[PDB]
Amino acid sequence: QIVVGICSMAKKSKSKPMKEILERISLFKYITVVVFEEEVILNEPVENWPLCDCLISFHSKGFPLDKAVAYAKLRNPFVINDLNMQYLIQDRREVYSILQAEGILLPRYAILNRDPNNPKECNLIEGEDHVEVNGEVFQKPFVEKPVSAEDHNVYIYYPTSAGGGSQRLFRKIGSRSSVYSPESNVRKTGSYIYEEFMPTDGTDVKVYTVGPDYAHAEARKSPALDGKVERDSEGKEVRYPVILNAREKLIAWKVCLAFKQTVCGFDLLRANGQSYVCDVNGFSFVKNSMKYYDDCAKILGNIVMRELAPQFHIPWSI
Ligand SMILES: Nc1ncnc2c1ncn2[C@@H]1O[C@H](COP(=O)(O)OP(=O)(O)OP(=O)(O)O)[C@@H](O)[C@H]1O
């Protein structure tokens, strides 16, 4: 029996989509699924962690990535999502650098690094309708993102001509994903990425891959200009259908390989006849889609079998 180890925080490992997917992987004749207990992950040394032949491990808040890396180095399992890349995914500056290296379209942007050791350094000049970052001008509207990919406090600054002020985005609190603020001045402390605001039709596209050749997309209302979350007549968040075009299917292929995360998600902005990526989230499942659960589990089980059946002298064709 090939053992597939699942290593993440309990919030993730016990989520409905995870359980749905692991149920289906368990249907593979030669695969056994072992889910690492969060108490073991946090409290036990990696030498006591359960063995596996294939590891699916991913960082989220509170997760000890150093320990996951140490475990994989100790046991040498087949790794589905590369662990070292998961440090980089936490830093938006590292993300944009990789996308640029891969020739992936993204908004024009500039990084503002604020060193607390150097108070006499200034690389941002603010005007009424623009900012100058490292000498480069961004006219309003522009977007201001914390360099930490885990900090969802993204602000959008409106031009005088539209009423000024700003939209402050945040991790969804129930009925809301953003709020308007009369504040027109940018944040005075911290490091930020500034980028051009891309006009879309009011929706954001979310793409979810299972390896480079499978990508499911769906859209939702953008929190950019209105912060009210749309809900079903039943009560679920409203999603819109998306089919990726050939250029976008290629983007998905590139993002998956560049960041070395088999199961991963990223965002697309459809603007000016093109598609821009400027958020890469790593390990992500689609929720509430039985077809996705079916396909995801099949792809993952097939990947495991293809890689490992030879070692275990298990019959497996193509
Ligand atoms: N350059 C841009 N132009 C237009 N809209 C943007 C731009 N950058 C981000 N947005 C809007 O801001 C929202 C939040 O930005 P982004 O997704 O980068 O932040 P995040 O905090 O990483 O969100 P999450 O990880 O939950 O998907 C996007 O979904 C999109 O609606």
Is the distance from the beta carbon of residue 222 to the nearest atom of ligand 1 less than 6 Å? yes
**Do 104 and 134 lie in a common domain?**
yes
Q: Tell me the β-bridge partners of 241.
A: 218
281 is in an annotated binding site: yes
Q: Same domain for 28 and 55?
A: yes
Cα-to-centroid distance, 53 and ligand 1 (Å): 37
How many domains does the structure of the chain reveal? 2
122 and 269, same structural domain? yes
CA atoms within a 13 Å half-sphere pointing along the CA-CB vector of 295: 16
154 lines ligand 1 (CB under 6 A): yes
Kind plus residue range of the DSSP H or E element containing 131: strand 130-133
Rounded to the nearest angstrom, the distance between the alpha carbon of 294 and the centre of ligand 1 is: 29
Burial label, 152 (beta-carbon count in 10 A; 0-12, 13-18, 19+) = middle
Q: Examine the domain organization and report whether 258 and 294 are in the same domain.
A: no
Same domain, 172 and 309: no
Amino acid, res. 284: S
Residues 44 and 148 in one domain: no
Do 114 and 191 share a structural domain?
Answer: yes
- Say how far apart CA 83 and CA 282 lie, in whole Å: 11
> For tokens 């890689």, what's the residue?
307
Q: How far is the CA of 227 from the centre of ligand 1 (A)?
A: 13
Distance (Å, whole) CA 12 – CA 21: 12
User: What is the pairing mode between strands 215-221 and 274-276?
Assistant: unpaired
State the distance from the centre of ligand 1 to the C-alpha of 152, rounded, in angstroms: 9
Out of 91, 142, 221, 269, mutate this one to test ligand 1's pocket (max ligand atoms within 8 Å of CB): namely 269
With a 6 Å cutoff on the Cβ, whether 223 touches ligand 1 is yes
Distance in angstroms (rounded) separating the CA atoms of residues 226 and 127: 25
Q: What is the CATH number of the domain that holds 109?
A: 3.30.470.20
Number of residues that this document lists for the chain: 318
Report the 10 Å Cβ neighbour count for 304.
Answer: 22
Determine the Cα–Cα distance for residues 284 and 312; give it in Å rounded to an integer.
30
Distance 143 CA to ligand 1 centre (A): 9
And the tokens for 209? 């891959």
Is there a single domain that holds both residue 195 and residue 248? Answer: yes
Q: Are residues 124 and 260 in the same domain?
A: yes
Report DSSP letters for 239-264, one per residue.
-EE----HHHHHHHHHHHHHHTBSEE
| Mutation to probe ligand 1, out of 169, 203, 218 (largest number of atoms < 8 A from CB) | 169
Tell me, yes or no, whether 247 and 103 share the same domain.
yes
Q: Which amino acid, 92?
A: R
Looking at ligand 1, which atom is closest to the CA of residue 278? Answer: 18
Question: Does residue 92 share a domain with residue 144?
Answer: yes
The domain containing residue 190 runs over which residues?
83-284
Q: What is the resolution of this structure in A?
A: 1.9
What are the Cα distances from residue 303, in Å, to 25, 74, 181, 266? 11, 22, 48, 21
187 and 232 in a common domain: yes
For residue 98, give every residue at least 6 positions away whose Cβ sits within 8 Å of its Cβ, in sequence order, or none: 88, 258, 259, 280
